[model samples]
Target: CILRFIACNGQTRAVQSRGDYQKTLAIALKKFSLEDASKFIVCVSQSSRIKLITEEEFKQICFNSSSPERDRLIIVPKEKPCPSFEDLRRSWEIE
Candidate 1:
């Protein structure tokens, strides 16, 4: 599945494969530039209580389990620069 994620530079890409989202450059964008790690995310917490308070919030929502934020997410451009979970921790400044 493809998903659109934006770079810190505001450049957007449509990522297609899970593998492509893990590149070093991809992580760098989320790490140093403050890109939304969930820009292309399609799922949410199965609970209504887990409201998405922000457009950029990457909180895990489970139908049965927490997703990688990449599990079946979609987008366009024949692309994917991306970021990840550990990256999420960093994106949130969570030590």
Candidate 2:
């Protein structure tokens, strides 16, 4: 899903994609001369799979000349909760 934000010029814009946003974020972070290895947290609603992107990894993915559609970058925050063992076991009992 794309997120909409208003720019300083009073224009409404949509974030192209998570990958694109991450690239922009990484650049901003670097420009500030922040920590070399800064960490960020991302969270998504209940999904079994998610993507993780880092500064170096995001740069490599974005700069590559391959098909943009082929790029599937997502960053899943570690703080997000995972299914409990009881939850998994309940699935088997129901069948």
Candidate 3:
């Protein structure tokens, strides 16, 4: 199966807060209509916990996800939680 995942850096206080993270996610999801919301899942991970948000639930609470930081919307996929060293390596490994 194909899955789309969004990984954010937890080191940032904004990304670390569940409320802040979800608010950002809501904005991204809103671009899609209600019908499309059902096909996707939203999840947030911190130091030790991972929380899942349903499409309907996400839409209902989307207002909380907004932020002044527009740059936070960049979504990337991963097989596991993002590694600390990945950011440093990204600059050199890209072609």
Candidate 4:
């Protein structure tokens, strides 16, 4: 699968497979100037909903090329522990 990640600053990066997720994330972190300690969160946006992705789920999506949100990976850098759903909506809309 071709994995894609959209950063908070509207930058995007793609990698060929799940094995590249960590490397892709590191590149995105530096490219976007996001703190390595900021606690990165990953999500996928659907028509009317977004789902937070766990490491397992991320791998699953990579394996399942037919996944609905396989191309909409949203990587957020969060200082706060909790995420505001509206922020996800806004981020998706801005793109």
Candidate 5:
């Protein structure tokens, strides 16, 4: 396995099979409380920016990524939650 996936609360898993990949996503949704959304996002780092991946691009990376390319396989919430000043301030602690 060459790739790893991650979600909120630092939940992450490395892939050795597509079965586990799908299971990881499903579990992450529940564990991260993201199942309410229509879909979550898959992102990877492109230089300094976090780039969202298309479905095709995701599958391609899952199959073809190399050890050196194993970086920033992020799973983020699909929907933006309502903002709060305290939440904004606290966000900097982790981000």
Candidate 6:
């Protein structure tokens, strides 16, 4: 079985299967640094994207056994809670 995970600095890896996700994280200890580990997870989803979801949110979405669905990510911005849209949408008219 093959599994994939992303570490700090956009570093990603795929394991051939053995042990649990926690086990994999432990094994990855040597490969990724503490900083990268902070980003740590997400990707089990089909679309595989989230914004400002926090670590806990990512876990709930990614680490679940039976995920809600496989969601593919359309876009990922440098940030989230995208104030630009929220701030501007109100002023911008439908016209």
Question: Which candidate leads in lDDT?
Answer: 4
RMSD of each: 12.8, 12.8, 11.9, 5.3, 7.4, 11.4
Per-residue CA lDDT of candidate 1, range 1-95, in tens?
54434332233334444344444223423553444433433222233322221222332322234444443221212134232322232222211
lDDT of 4 by residue, 2-95 (tens): 6666665445555544554455455555565465723576656545555555554664553243544345565665554333353254445533
Clashing residue pairs for model 3: 23-64, 23-65, 24-65
- What pairs collide in candidate 1? 2-74, 2-75, 3-74, 3-75, 14-79, 15-79, 15-80, 45-61
lDDT of 5: 0.45
Cα TM-score per model:
0.25, 0.24, 0.24, 0.54, 0.49, 0.36
* lDDT values for all models: 0.32, 0.30, 0.32, 0.52, 0.45, 0.33
Deviation (Å) of 4 in candidate 5: 1.9
Taking all chains together, the TM-score of candidate 6 against the true structure is 0.36
Give residue 76's lDDT in candidate 2 (0 to 100). 26
Q: For candidate 3, write residues 18-67 as lDDT tens digits.
A: 34434444433334212222233454322233344443343223223442
Q: What is the TM-score (0 to 1) of candidate 1?
A: 0.25
Candidate 1 achieves a global lDDT of: 0.32
Please give the clash total of every predicted structure, in order.
Answer: 8, 1, 3, 0, 0, 7
lDDT over C-alpha atoms for residue 86 of model 2:
20
Model 6: C-alpha RMSD to truth?
11.4
Candidate scoring better on TM-score of 1 and 4: 4
Candidate 3, lDDT over the whole model: 0.32
On TM-score, the leading prediction is: 4
Cα lDDT of model 5 by residue, 1-95, tens digit: 44455555445545432443344445445555466422665555433344554443554553243334433355566564221222123222322
Model 2, span 30-79: residue lDDT tens: 33323221343222112343223344444344324332231222232233
How many pairs in model 5 have backbone atoms within 3 A of each other, for residues 3 or more apart or on separate chains, i.e. clashes? 0
Tell me which residue pairs clash in candidate 6: 8-36, 46-70, 46-71, 46-72, 47-71, 47-72, 47-73
Instruction: Report lDDT (Cα) of residue 5, candidate 3.
Output: 26
